[PDB]
Amino acid sequence: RGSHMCDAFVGTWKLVSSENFDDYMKEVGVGFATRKVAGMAKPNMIISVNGDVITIKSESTFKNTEISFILGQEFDEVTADDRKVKSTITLDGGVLVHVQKWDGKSTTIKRKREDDKLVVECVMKGVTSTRVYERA
Numbered sequence: 001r002g003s004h005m006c007d008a009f010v011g012t013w014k015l016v017s018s019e020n021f022d023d024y025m026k027e028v029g030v031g032f033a034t035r036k037v038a039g040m041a042k043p044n045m046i047i048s049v050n051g052d053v054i055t056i057k058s059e060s061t062f063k064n065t066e067i068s069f070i071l072g073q074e075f076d077e078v079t080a081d082d083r084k085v086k087s088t089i090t091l092d093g094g095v096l097v098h099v100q101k102w103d104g105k106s107t108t109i110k111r112k113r114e115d116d117k118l119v120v121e122c123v124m125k126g127v128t129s130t131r132v133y134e135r136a
């Protein structure tokens with residue numbers, strides 16, 4: 001089994017900057033106490049690929065979470081803020097596009113490589129948050 005373009009995401013990443021994330025969590029519907037505690041967190045993101053299966057882990061003082069998935073195939077996810085969502089992740093021109101649907105709501109998380117960084121864009125309606133990660 002050979003290399004894949006998405007191996008560019010593989011590695012250990014740490015959060016280095018965040019913008020508008022509190023507003024993004026508000027639009028998602030995250031309650032007060034969770035927003036305050038989660039807004040303080042500096043998560044590590046650990047991405048690995050094994051065959052068709054991509055695994056993304058998030059570790060922080062707030063919560064430790066993990067998702068494993070195959071591109072284009074819907075799965076059940078319990079988010080860090082305790083939402084139970086249906087998720088589908090696909091590869092669009094080098095960008096991992098992650099859509100979560102729940103309670104009639106929808107949010108989109110994009111992960112992309114920019115220079116030596118992994119840039120995350122969290123979009124909920126008209127509210128966007130940027131989370132920038134660097135190699136740990």
Ligand SMILES: O=C(O)c1cc(F)ccc1Nc1cccc(Cl)c1-c1ccccc1
Nearest residue numbers: 038039041043058060062080081109120131
């Ligand atoms: O935290 C990131 O950067 C991130 C990146 C992603 F690609 C996808 C999700 C992310 N985090 C969250 C999304 C919604 C709600 C919450 Cl509470 C979190 C969250 C906050 C603090 C610690 C752990 C998780």
